[PDB]
Design a binder for this molecule. Structure first.
Ligand code: HOP
Lengths: 211, 221
């Protein structure tokens, strides 16, 4: 019933910045709004209730404000430990409803990925299956595009990507894309290639191999 | 003093029902509502409903009505949530949390969460395939190599390189659930080219649910 529109859906910020996250309710909720913080692998934690009351024990750099339909959470000077996901929740009317979340990550300078491609091993081929892997190593920001081409044929739906969390030392990410094919088909073709698009590349890069 | 202890991870077949528990302590169970929340990756947090132990009993989100049923046992201070007719859409972490009370409220206490995986898959050790580097030269170039840990169930798998002595430049990616219904992950590491001939790189893989233990040497070739 009550729609909570939370913004932005994600943001990159630097230590020391003031971060403001916005929640707008489709109707007036009389300040019955809470803010939660959730870090990787941990349960969520309540930061603010009734729009502006600080839960005991939460650092005062967090504050909430607003009334009516417009609310916000502010972190006055961002600290590394604040990275994670934030949600608002209205509890004025049933069903209580959460905003869709704001992913807060650490900002750094753009870094193109180094790209590597790996042919399936002979070990796996006996097994009858073929996995071709493409690795995008140490890049930033997160958005990236990976397109698989087998001879000239664009592959769709037979690949899956996985991404690491920002590295704790260098704030970059890494990503793997695995293209799966039957042993039959793999043999049936010649040129395997992954084309990678990313902001740090002034032009798409392709790494490929001939079966 | 106030704590909510939730029951262990559960692996259920599609179509079954599962009852998860939330044992509350350090406060008067009957006057605080117990809230239930679902988190599927990629679907943020969802409110399921809440129940007031002893009193005014329940409020459900019309969407989970029929899928979820709450109950709470006052003598044991335990609240329960039953999910029925499970599907993959129900695979998620489920949290209980203590909400408000007639007289007092000042935020929430959250349970540690209960993971529920719904799959018809059978326990299975993975096959570990090498991701061989291609470089072998120029006084210290930079090559990537790794291991593909394929087709195991259920999570998780653990991966280390050279029994843990190589941790620098190592990225073990999140597992991905394949259409086959089995999981797959890769672990990769970048080393100096120069070593590809000298040094050995073995990835150590452990899948406890199937008591699989593999040490995989990955060499250029
Ligand atoms: O009868 C009435 O309308 C309420 C009268 C006074 N009520 C309150 O002050 C009051 C009412 C409701 C709440 C809510 C706050 C969020 C809390 C919660 C926390 C985490 C996850 C889900 C839900 C549940 C709690 O239940 C907090 C305070």
């Amino acid at each position: 019933d009550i729609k909570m529109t939370q913004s932005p859906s994600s943001m990159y910020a630097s230590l020391g910045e003031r971060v403001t996250i916005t929640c707008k309710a489709s109707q007036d909720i009389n300040s019955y709004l809470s803010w939660f913080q959730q870090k990787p692998g941990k349960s969520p934690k309540t930061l603010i209730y009734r729009a502006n009351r600080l839960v005991d024990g939460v650092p005062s750099r967090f504050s909430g404000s607003g009334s009516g339909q417009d609310y916000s959470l502010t972190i006055s000077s961002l600290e590394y430990e604040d990275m994670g996901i934030y949600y608002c929740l209205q509890y004025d009317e049933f069903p209580y409803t959460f905003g869709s979340g704001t992913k807060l990550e650490i900002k750094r300078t753009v870094a193109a990925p180094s790209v590597f491609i790996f042919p399936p091993s002979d070990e796996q081929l006996k097994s009858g299956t073929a996995s071709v892997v493409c690795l995008l190593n140490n890049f930033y920001p997160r958005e990236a595009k990976v397109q698989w081409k087998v001879d000239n044929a664009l592959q769709s739906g037979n690949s899956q990507e996985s991404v690491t969390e920002q590295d704790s030392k260098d704030s970059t990410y890494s990503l793997s894309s695995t293209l799966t094919l039957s042993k039959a088909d793999y043999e049936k073709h010649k040129v395997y290639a992954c084309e990678v698009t990313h902001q740090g590349l002034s032009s798409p890069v392709t790494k490929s191999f001939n079966r | 003093q106030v704590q909510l202890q939730q029951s262990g991870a559960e692996l259920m077949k599609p179509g079954a029902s599962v009852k998860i528990s939330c044992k509350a302590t350090g406060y008067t169970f009957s006057s605080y509502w117990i809230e239930w929340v679902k988190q599927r990756p990629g679907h943020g947090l969802e409110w399921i409903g809440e129940i007031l132990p002893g009193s005014g009993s329940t409020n459900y989100n019309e969407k989970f009505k029929g899928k979820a049923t709450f109950t709470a046992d006052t003598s044991s201070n335990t609240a329960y949530m039953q999910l029925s007719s499970l599907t993959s859409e129900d695979s998620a972490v489920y949290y209980c949390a203590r909400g408000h009370s007639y007289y007092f409220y000042d935020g929430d206490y959250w349970g540690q969460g209960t993971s529920v995986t719904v799959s018809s898959a059978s326990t299975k050790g993975p096959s570990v395939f090498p991701l061989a580097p291609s470089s072998k030269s120029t006084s210290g170039g930079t090559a990537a190599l790794g291991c593909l840990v394929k087709d195991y169930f259920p999570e998780p798998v653990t991966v280390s390189w050279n029994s843990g002595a190589l941790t620098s430049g190592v990225h073990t990616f999140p597992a991905v659930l394949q259409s086959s219904g089995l999981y797959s992950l890769s672990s990769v590491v970048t080393v100096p080219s120069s070593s590809l001939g000298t040094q050995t790189y073995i990835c150590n893989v452990n899948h406890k649910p199937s008591n699989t233990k593999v040490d995989k040497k990955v060499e250029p070739k």
